[PDB]
Design a protein around this ligand. Structure first.
Ligand SMILES: CCCCCCCCCCCC(=O)OC[C@H](COP(=O)(O)OCC[N+](C)(C)C)OC(=O)CCCCCCCCCCC
Ligand SMILES: C[C@@H]1CC[C@@]2(OC1)O[C@H]1C[C@H]3[C@@H]4CC=C5C[C@@H](OCCC(CO)CO)CC[C@]5(C)[C@H]4CC[C@]3(C)[C@H]1[C@@H]2C
Ligand SMILES: C[C@@H]1CC[C@@]2(OC1)O[C@H]1C[C@H]3[C@@H]4CC=C5C[C@@H](OCCC(CO)CO)CC[C@]5(C)[C@H]4CC[C@]3(C)[C@H]1[C@@H]2C
Ligand SMILES: C[C@@H]1CC[C@@]2(OC1)O[C@H]1C[C@H]3[C@@H]4CC=C5C[C@@H](OCCC(CO)CO)CC[C@]5(C)[C@H]4CC[C@]3(C)[C@H]1[C@@H]2C
Ligand SMILES: C[C@@H]1CC[C@@]2(OC1)O[C@H]1C[C@H]3[C@@H]4CC=C5C[C@@H](OCCC(CO)CO)CC[C@]5(C)[C@H]4CC[C@]3(C)[C@H]1[C@@H]2C
Ligand SMILES: C[C@@H]1CC[C@@]2(OC1)O[C@H]1C[C@H]3[C@@H]4CC=C5C[C@@H](OCCC(CO)CO)CC[C@]5(C)[C@H]4CC[C@]3(C)[C@H]1[C@@H]2C
Ligand SMILES: C[C@@H]1CC[C@@]2(OC1)O[C@H]1C[C@H]3[C@@H]4CC=C5C[C@@H](OCCC(CO)CO)CC[C@]5(C)[C@H]4CC[C@]3(C)[C@H]1[C@@H]2C
Ligand SMILES: C[C@@H]1CC[C@@]2(OC1)O[C@H]1C[C@H]3[C@@H]4CC=C5C[C@@H](OCCC(CO)CO)CC[C@]5(C)[C@H]4CC[C@]3(C)[C@H]1[C@@H]2C
Ligand SMILES: C[C@@H]1CC[C@@]2(OC1)O[C@H]1C[C@H]3[C@@H]4CC=C5C[C@@H](OCCC(CO)CO)CC[C@]5(C)[C@H]4CC[C@]3(C)[C@H]1[C@@H]2C
Lengths: 39, 325, 51, 60, 38, 325, 60, 51, 39, 38
């Protein structure tokens, strides 16, 4: 179905960029985000 | 009856959301490196002659791929006036002149003369108690028999103490030979206790999103994402699509400041500012590595700041000197 | 309304004004700073930072 | 078809091994780009923090 | 170049969008009141 | 009867003058930046596993205009043997292997394989009590039916405890299709208590002169000058002439080393090596500015050195381990 | 020939003033290239020398 | 003296030798270092500096 | 006479380079050389 | 390419210069003795 079109050449950058943003938001907004803090 | 509205407004906890231009300052101005990165050597010698009025002179030298080899800059500011000017090597003058009408409203102005393209840019900014409005005009002209130039109207409203909505309307015509061009961009901003998120639906369909979280008093991190679409790059209809997202963090130390950032295109960047003890010098190391091509851009800077000001002599006035930057 | 006679005169006025600030702007800034800075620096220091 | 099978595997290992080479190089420099400037800056911050705390002890 | 009639049409839309912008701008300015009414 | 000669030589105060290749080491190796300058980022991670035998491994990363992006290197050395080898990113192997025959004579060797050009180079160096001799062969071959390749014979003699004279004869033929090519270069070197001057009248008429003075234990300075001539570049006979002279100084501090240099072509260079406290890291900052074109080249390097050696366990052996570098 | 005399002076002053501009720029950066790294290095050397000298006094 | 029969054989012998060192040289260095270094490092450290 | 030829375009680099070397040698070997020493 | 006779001439000089080099090399090796004799 659509999962073939999801990885098309044109949608490559957009879908990759969205996923990276999605991970970063969760990473910062979760207890894992504390890993960046050093003291 | 305008008094009735105000007495109703004060019942809420609303507060100024800032300007549309600053709707993503935390991510795109404080943490990410996009504005501070450079290449080649650079040096900024500065001297401060006073603080009330604020008077300051500075020379900038640069080299390498940073081809612009010199720029003299002077800055004069006071409670009602702020005037500044850069005069680069080729004689091109870049200026700035903001005049304050009152506590909240100022009338910025920015000219560029000489060089590639002459430009003028006026804007009347009003930082209301619970909203920000700003009408801007770029290279305005009526001499062509009618209104001409780019006009921008910003507006940002606080709807609930955390959330702020606003839009930026545009209007432009490059000569009376053609019809005008208009656009609208919608903006939103949400600020919780420790994190701030904002979005921007721009004219071309491009969407920009950002997220900033303050992990601790010394550590911040934020991520921004840009999506865009262009018309039929395939030459056979359709629309091409692209996007990029960057993640970065800023660390504030006692005598240093460190920022790191990585794009979605494999480009990794780093910037370190160190202040040398009691002296006013502040080195700046900026490195940028692209992992796809394995090429690297490198830059070092040294900023000096002499001064002839007895700080406590004038700092008492500077603390309350509301220069209209 | 606009007329050809007015257009030429106003057009050059902007050009005259454009060149006036292009040269005489920074000298105006330095004049303001040197005249009304809290201490008036010895004119030598003005354009010799970090002497 | 002995050669055809041989070529495929050699191309495979050349690819992944080359990929492993680039991945290891990228990680190592990216560690140095952030590792070296950060450790230098961080080391100073700890040094000042210990010193100021040590100063308080002397005062007390 | 463009025809006279089309120029009026283009300007007709351009004012409309700006007219649309202000209408929306006023809506936001009045928005906090309705939120309080919830 | 050769013993009679020795009993006469010992009467004088002569001593080894070094080698032709090192006749200007003080100026062109210790003080001037020519061999240490670089561009773009760089890093060298090293680990030492022992000192007797000396065993060592190191990786080098580089970027920017320093395009060579990686080079693994291993080093093994002992009293009799020293073997080393680099393996750059494209697989090209650069090696070295020196075997000591005795207290004074070592047969070096150096191969370059893969990459641009395959090359082999042998040389049998003898460091006598009052002279240095060396016969070198580059890509030697007899398979063309006759001797072929490049052969170099050096020789440097002490005539009086301060002055050293010597010459470097060459002989080469690139295939039996043509006659051989021969040349001779004359060398001189004078050393006083505090300064050293050396000249090199090379084959092409080019003349190289140098001067090194040790101002204090921590400060050195030297200047070298090169003159050269080429055949009738005007295309109408005659000879074209050119030359360049550089002046540089090196400052040794407790935890740093600083070198500066300026050419005769208006090119100013600088190099700062700083060692970070007790840790083994050493930062190297190299900048280069050409005033004629106002372009600048910048480079930063970080060298790390871990180790698994109890220094006092093996240092006593290292101080006496005469590795034939 | 009023213009010819005027042109020569304008070309002369432009040439020397431009030459004076380049010379001043070259001196300023050349001072920064050597001045900044050297002063940073030299400052530390003095700091260590005073510290070790101070250490000797305490040992005495 | 040289002959066509001898030249071809010696020519490839060098070529065989050239490839032998091109690959096996560094492994020979690491072998010597790992085998007879004063302390024998754990093989993990050998090619993982600054672990 | 020859002093005109001394500054010829081709001899410019050579004669300029010789003078710079001449000055440097005198500077270092003279009492002025101590200027570089800072302590 | 070069003619046979010229090749011999080129090699004749090449050996001479190398022969010249060694003769000079021995001269330097013997030079310290004459200096002492002054
Ligand atoms: C591929 C992987 C590559 C990795 C590369 C990593 C590189 C890391 C570099 C970190 C640099 C850093 O911050 O150092 C900065 C260091 C000093 O800092 P410090 O030693 O802490 O100071 C002292 C610390 N005390 C107090 C603990 C002792 O100054 C330098 O070096 C010199 C900087 C010279 C700047 C010259 C500017 C010239 C301007 C000219 C205008 C025309
Ligand atoms: C989870 C962590 C955060 C995110 C992240 O790390 C892990 O995830 C990694 C995935 C990487 C991408 C993977 C694939 C490629 C394709 C390559 O080739 C394009 C075709 C042509 C050139 O156009 C060459 O054939 C270009 C590079 C790119 C886009 C990578 C970029 C960096 C990325 C985004 C990295 C990013 C830092
Ligand atoms: C902190 C970060 C964590 C994530 C990350 O490190 C640091 O992990 C690395 C893995 C890398 C990829 C590995 C293999 C290849 C193959 C080849 O693909 C282009 C074809 C080439 C010709 O063959 C063009 O020259 C080279 C590039 C690519 C895609 C790398 C891209 C950068 C990547 C994504 C790096 C990424 C930034
Ligand atoms: C996998 C990808 C490759 C790039 C990368 O991840 C993604 O690889 C990680 C390695 C990290 C460093 C590891 C060790 C240290 C030492 C520490 O020294 C204080 C020690 C102690 C003193 O009391 C207090 O911790 C300071 C921090 C530093 C330099 C790290 C910095 C971030 C780095 C470079 C990370 C970088 C983003
Ligand atoms: C993944 C990779 C693993 C290797 C690596 O990360 C990336 O691991 C990190 C450890 C770092 C060092 C840790 C400590 C300090 C001490 C400080 O000393 C001045 C302060 C002074 C006050 O008293 C005390 O020294 C100077 C900096 C230095 C030497 C660091 C340099 C960079 C190093 C070597 C990094 C290295 C690149
Ligand atoms: C006493 C101190 C030591 C010596 C020294 O300082 C003072 O004296 C200075 C004189 C400088 C040169 C003057 C004239 C030019 C011509 C210019 O233009 C050529 C034509 C074309 C390019 O070919 C461009 O138009 C090229 C540069 C050059 C050669 C200067 C080089 C630097 C020099 C050697 C300086 C050197 C460091
Ligand atoms: C420590 C050092 C002491 C000496 C030194 O500073 C620092 O003193 C400076 C004077 C400089 C020259 C002044 C004027 C010009 C004119 C113009 O000549 C090329 C024509 C141009 C087009 O007009 C090409 O673009 C530009 C170059 C040149 C010759 C300068 C060269 C560098 C010089 C020699 C510098 C030199 C290094
Ligand atoms: C004319 C050409 C232009 C370039 C140049 O000449 C040639 O201009 C010179 C200016 C010099 C600096 C002047 C002042 C200082 C301050 C001092 O700070 C410790 C002060 C005190 C602490 O107790 C002990 O003195 C350190 C040295 C430094 C930076 C000089 C460095 C060399 C410089 C950069 C010279 C450089 C070669
Ligand atoms: C011709 C030009 C005129 C201007 C100029 O020369 C050339 O004049 C020089 C003065 C220099 C500074 C003097 C002192 C120090 C103190 C030291 O502090 C860390 C040590 C710490 C130990 O306790 C105490 O601070 C860091 C370096 C710094 C700030 C110098 C930076 C470069 C400067 C600004 C130079 C500048 C370029």
């Amino acid at each position: 179905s659509t999962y073939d079109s999801l990885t098309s050449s044109e949608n490559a950058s957009v879908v990759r960029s969205i996923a990276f943003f999605g991970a970063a938001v969760a990473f910062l907004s979760s207890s894992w985000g504390e890993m960046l803090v050093v003291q | 009856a305008f008094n009735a509205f105000q007495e109703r407004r004060k019942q809420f906890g609303l507060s100024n959301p800032g300007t549309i231009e600053t709707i993503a300052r935390e991510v795109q101005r404080d943490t990410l490196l996009t504005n501070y990165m450079f290449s080649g050597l650079r040096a900024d010698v500065t001297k401060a002659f006073s603080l009330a009025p604020l008077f300051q002179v500075s020379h900038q030298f640069a080299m390498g791929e940073r081809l612009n080899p010199y720029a003299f800059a002077a800055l004069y500011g006071t409670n009602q006036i702020f005037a500044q000017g850069n005069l680069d090597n080729e004689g091109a003058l870049s200026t700035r002149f903001n005049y304050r009408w009152g506590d909240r409203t100022i009338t910025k102005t920015q000219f560029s003369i000489g060089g590639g393209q002459d430009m003028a840019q006026f804007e009347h900014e009003h930082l209301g108690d619970d909203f920000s409005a700003s009408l801007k005009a770029i290279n305005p002209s009526f001499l062509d028999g009618g209104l001409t130039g780019i006009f921008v109207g910003d507006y940002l409203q606080a709807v609930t103490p955390r959330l702020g909505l606003g839009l930026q309307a545009v209007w432009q015509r490059q000569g009376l030979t053609q019809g005008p061009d208009t656009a609208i961009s919608y903006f939103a901003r949400y600020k919780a206790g420790d994190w701030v998120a904002s979005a921007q639906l721009q004219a071309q369909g491009a969407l920009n999103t950002s997220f900033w979280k303050k992990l601790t008093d010394r550590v911040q991190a934020g991520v921004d994402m840009t999506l865009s679409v262009a018309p039929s790059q395939s030459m056979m209809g359709g629309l091409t699509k692209e996007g990029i997202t960057t993640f970065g963090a800023k660390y504030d130390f006692r005598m240093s400041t460190f920022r790191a950032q990585i794009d979605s295109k494999g480009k990794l960047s780093c910037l370190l500012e160190k202040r040398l003890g009691a002296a006013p010098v502040t080195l700046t190391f900026a490195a940028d590595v692209d992992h796809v091509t394995q090429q690297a851009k490198l830059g070092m800077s040294v900023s000096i700041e002499a001064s002839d000001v007895d700080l406590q002599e004038q700092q008492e006035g500077a603390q309350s000197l509301n220069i209209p930057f | 309304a606009l007329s050809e006679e007015s257009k030429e005169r106003i057009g050059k006025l902007i050009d005259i004004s454009r060149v006036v600030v292009h040269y005489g702007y920074l000298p105006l800034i330095l004049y303001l700073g040197y005249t009304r800075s809290v201490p008036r620096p010895s004119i030598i220091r003005l354009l010799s930072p970090l002497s | 078809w002995f050669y055809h099978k041989y070529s495929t595997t050699t191309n495979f290992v050349k690819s992944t091994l080359s990929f492993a080479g680039r991945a290891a190089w990228a990680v190592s420099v990216s560690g140095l780009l952030i590792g070296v400037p950060f450790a230098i800056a961080f080391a100073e911050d700890q040094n000042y923090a210990a010193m100021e705390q040590e100063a308080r002890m002397r005062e007390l | 170049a463009l025809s006279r009639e089309e120029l009026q049409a283009a300007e007709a839309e351009a004012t409309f969008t700006i007219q649309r912008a202000v209408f929306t701008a006023v809506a936001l300015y009045l928005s906090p009141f309705v939120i309080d009414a919830v």
